[PDB]
Scaffold this motif. Structure first.
Motif, PDB file in Angstrom:
ATOM      1  N   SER A 163       1.410  -1.651   0.027  1.00  0.00           N
ATOM      2  CA  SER A 163      -0.287   0.196  -0.456  1.00  0.00           C
ATOM      3  C   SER A 163       0.809   0.816   0.016  1.00  0.00           C
ATOM      4  O   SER A 163       2.245   0.889   0.312  1.00  0.00           O
ATOM      5  N   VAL A 164       0.287   2.144  -1.111  1.00  0.00           N
ATOM      6  CA  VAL A 164       0.615   3.825  -0.428  1.00  0.00           C
ATOM      7  C   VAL A 164       1.898   3.821   1.202  1.00  0.00           C
ATOM      8  O   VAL A 164       2.497   4.503   1.195  1.00  0.00           O
ATOM      9  N   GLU A 165       0.716   3.762   1.661  1.00  0.00           N
ATOM     10  CA  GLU A 165       1.058   3.681   3.602  1.00  0.00           C
ATOM     11  C   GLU A 165       2.104   3.516   3.854  1.00  0.00           C
ATOM     12  O   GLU A 165       3.435   3.533   4.530  1.00  0.00           O
ATOM     13  N   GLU A 166       2.368   1.926   3.769  1.00  0.00           N
ATOM     14  CA  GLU A 166       3.001   0.870   3.640  1.00  0.00           C
ATOM     15  C   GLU A 166       4.521   1.127   3.204  1.00  0.00           C
ATOM     16  O   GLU A 166       5.741   1.439   4.224  1.00  0.00           O
TER      17      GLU A 166
ATOM     18  N   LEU B 190       5.305   4.239   2.322  1.00  0.00           N
ATOM     19  CA  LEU B 190       5.775   5.641   2.202  1.00  0.00           C
ATOM     20  C   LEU B 190       7.059   5.033   3.910  1.00  0.00           C
ATOM     21  O   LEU B 190       7.819   5.401   4.622  1.00  0.00           O
ATOM     22  N   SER B 191       6.193   4.238   5.175  1.00  0.00           N
ATOM     23  CA  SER B 191       6.413   4.117   6.650  1.00  0.00           C
ATOM     24  C   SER B 191       7.782   2.858   6.307  1.00  0.00           C
ATOM     25  O   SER B 191       8.540   3.658   7.142  1.00  0.00           O
ATOM     26  N   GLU B 192       8.021   2.217   5.365  1.00  0.00           N
ATOM     27  CA  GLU B 192       8.698   1.154   5.406  1.00  0.00           C
ATOM     28  C   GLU B 192       9.704   1.844   5.189  1.00  0.00           C
ATOM     29  O   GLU B 192      11.033   1.751   5.918  1.00  0.00           O
TER      30      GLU B 192
ATOM     31  N   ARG C 279      10.901   5.190   5.259  1.00  0.00           N
ATOM     32  CA  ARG C 279      11.237   5.350   5.820  1.00  0.00           C
ATOM     33  C   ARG C 279      11.941   5.302   7.483  1.00  0.00           C
ATOM     34  O   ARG C 279      13.222   5.483   8.069  1.00  0.00           O
TER      35      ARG C 279
ATOM     36  N   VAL D  23       8.313   3.934  -4.109  1.00  0.00           N
ATOM     37  CA  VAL D  23       9.159   5.404  -2.909  1.00  0.00           C
ATOM     38  C   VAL D  23       9.766   5.909  -3.999  1.00  0.00           C
ATOM     39  O   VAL D  23      10.894   5.115  -4.185  1.00  0.00           O
TER      40      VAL D  23
ATOM     41  N   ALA E 294       4.983   8.322  -2.913  1.00  0.00           N
ATOM     42  CA  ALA E 294       4.909   6.922  -3.868  1.00  0.00           C
ATOM     43  C   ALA E 294       4.453   7.179  -4.810  1.00  0.00           C
ATOM     44  O   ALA E 294       3.740   8.351  -5.053  1.00  0.00           O
TER      45      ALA E 294
ATOM     46  N   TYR F 250       1.254   9.922  -4.318  1.00  0.00           N
ATOM     47  CA  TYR F 250       1.217  10.571  -3.127  1.00  0.00           C
ATOM     48  C   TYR F 250       2.065  11.693  -2.283  1.00  0.00           C
ATOM     49  O   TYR F 250       2.797  11.139  -2.159  1.00  0.00           O
TER      50      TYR F 250
END
Length: 113
Positions: free
Chosen positions: A24-27, A29-31, A33, A59, A78, A85
């Motif tokens: 996912s876009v949020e995962e 970006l999280s990973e 970072r 990313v 992302a 995003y």
């Protein structure tokens, strides 16, 4: 600190063993970072045929300003199915996990964290 000086190992796309950060876009970006903080993040320079060899979502690091101490200022954007995003400048490359691949170079960046 809002910004962190990092030296990112530049990997050849065909050497990369883990071709994305997640599903996912949020995962991703999280990973991305987390890996950037842990120094386990590599950079693949985007050219013809590179992106289709990596896993979406992507990313990107993008130039966020026009370069303290040699380090280009960048932020994360992302991309999934052609939608981005975030909004930033020129792509410096696509981030991937680094798991021991030999780099061809190092890209000094100042990451907006």
């Amino acid at each position: 600190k809002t910004h962190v000086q990092l030296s990112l190992p530049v990997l050849q796309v065909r050497d990369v063993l883990v071709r994305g950060f997640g599903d996912s876009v949020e995962e991703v970006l999280s990973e991305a970072r987390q890996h950037l903080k842990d120094g386990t993040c590599g950079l693949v320079e985007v050219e013809k045929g590179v992106l289709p060899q990596l896993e979406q979502p992507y990313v990107f690091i993008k130039r966020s300003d026009a370069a303290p101490h040699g380090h280009v200022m960048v932020e994360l954007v992302a991309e999934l199915e052609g939608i981005q995003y975030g909004r930033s400048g020129e792509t410096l490359g696509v981030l991937v996990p680094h798991v021991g691949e030999i780099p061809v170079a190092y890209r000094k960046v100042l990451l907006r964290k």
